[PDB]
């Protein structure tokens, strides 16, 4: 049972700009996703202080980076707060509208794509390297969901019947044919060291 949705006009515009603009410094997508993972882990850690039962779906707070050359995927996994169906379909897109407009205007005023995170829309930098993005997420109050988009103005949401993840988010980057350098161990290590060296959670780079 797959539900198909149209992105709000501003988000479809942002995704097109990210796909179409010539911009060589694509590596910045990784810092954006790791930073989102880190914010999600802070959120579950904060909530657990007043309600300890929120860690019943997993005590460990961490980030895994999983490359897979056979599937041509790079997966960012976290055991953070996770997302609800409402976040996936409408809540995040609503907040994204404001950030998208501010980012588009900043670009016209002379800013570059690396500043995307300051506008709360850093997640869409995934499309600098990915032809398709799959998001598997599980929030304590909701079910496990799979969000997916190859851009083109639409995204899908389905109940994920795959392997339960307990609590957290998995961002699966189906890389563009010319972006396989992001499956290489030394390339991932270099980017993490350059942009994500001060994240307060363990980041484990899996090897193939
Ligand atoms: C913006 C923003 C941050 C909030 C949404 N979000 C994101 C980025 C994100 C933003 C989105 O819109 C702006 C969004 O679209 C609905 C999205 O889902 C595909 C994600 Cl993953 N990553 C995580 C994560 N790792 N864990 C949790 F829990 N929430 C996340």
Return the SS3 of 182. Answer: helix
Residues 65-69: contacts with CB under 8 Å, at least 24 apart: 65/188, 65/192, 65/203, 65/204, 65/205, 65/206, 66/206, 67/182, 67/183, 67/184, 67/185, 67/188, 67/206, 67/208, 68/183, 68/208, 69/180, 69/183, 69/208
> The domain 1-208: what is its CATH number?
3.30.565.10
Within 13 Å, how many C-alpha atoms sit on residue 143's CB side?
Answer: 10
Q: From the CB of 29, is ligand 1 less than 6 Å away?
A: no
Experimental method: X-ray
Distance 183 CA to ligand 1 centre (A): 22
Resolution given for this structure, in angstroms: 1.7
- Residue 136's DSSP bridge partners are 146, 170
Q: From the CB of 17, is ligand 1 less than 6 Å away?
A: no
Return the SS3 of 64. Answer: strand
Q: Tell me what percent of the chain is helix, strand and coil, each rounded to the nearest 5.
A: 45, 25, 35
Strand order in the sheet with 130-138: 3-6, 154-159, 144-149, 130-138, 168-175, 73-78, 63-68, 203-205
What are the residues whose beta carbons fall under 8 Å from the beta carbon of 30, sequence distance 6 or more? 76, 182, 188, 191, 192, 195, 196
Tokens matching residue 21: 């603009």
Q: Kindly state the DSSP code that residue 54 receives in the 8-state scheme.
A: G
Tokens matching residue 116: 């995307």
Distance between CA atoms of residues 152 and 32, nearest Å: 22
- How many other CB atoms sit within 10 Å of the CB of residue 142? 15
Tell how many helices (H) and how many strands (E) occur in the chain.
Answer: 5, 8
The torsion of the CA quartet 27, 78, 3, 151, rounded to 10 degrees, works out to 0
Q: From the CB of 36, is ligand 1 less than 6 Å away?
A: yes
Return the SS3 of 23. Answer: coil
Contact 175, 27 (CB under 8 A): no
Q: Does 20 show up as a binding residue in the annotation? A: no
Contact 68, 205 (CB under 8 A): no
φ, ψ dihedrals at 182, nearest 5°: -80, 5
Residue bearing tokens 């949401």: 157
Strand-pair category, 130-138 with 168-175: antiparallel
């Amino acid at each position: 049972e797959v539900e198909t949705f149209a992105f709000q006009a501003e988000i479809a515009q942002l995704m097109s700009l990210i796909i179409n603009t010539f911009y060589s410094n694509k590596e910045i997508f990784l810092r954006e996703l790791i930073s989102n993972s880190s914010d999600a882990l802070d959120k579950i850690r904060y909530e657990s202080l007043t309600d300890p039962s929120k860690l019943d779906s997993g005590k460990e707070l961490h980030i895994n980076l999983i490359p897979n050359k056979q599937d041509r995927t790079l997966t960012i996994v976290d055991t953070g707060i996770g997302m609800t169906k409402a976040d996936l379909i409408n809540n995040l897109g609503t907040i994204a509208k404001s950030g998208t407009k501010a980012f588009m205007e900043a670009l016209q005023a002379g800013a570059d794509i690396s500043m995307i995170g300051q506008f709360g829309v850093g997640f869409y930098s995934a499309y600098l390297v990915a032809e398709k993005v799959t998001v598997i997420t599980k929030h304590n109050d909701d079910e496990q969901y799979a969000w997916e988009s190859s851009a083109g103005g639409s995204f899908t949401v389905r109940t994920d019947t795959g392997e339960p993840m307990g609590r957290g988010t998995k961002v699966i980057l189906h890389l563009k044919e010319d972006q396989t350098e992001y499956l290489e161990e030394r390339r991932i290590k270099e980017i993490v060291k350059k942009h994500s060296q001060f994240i307060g959670y363990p980041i484990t780079l899996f090897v193939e």
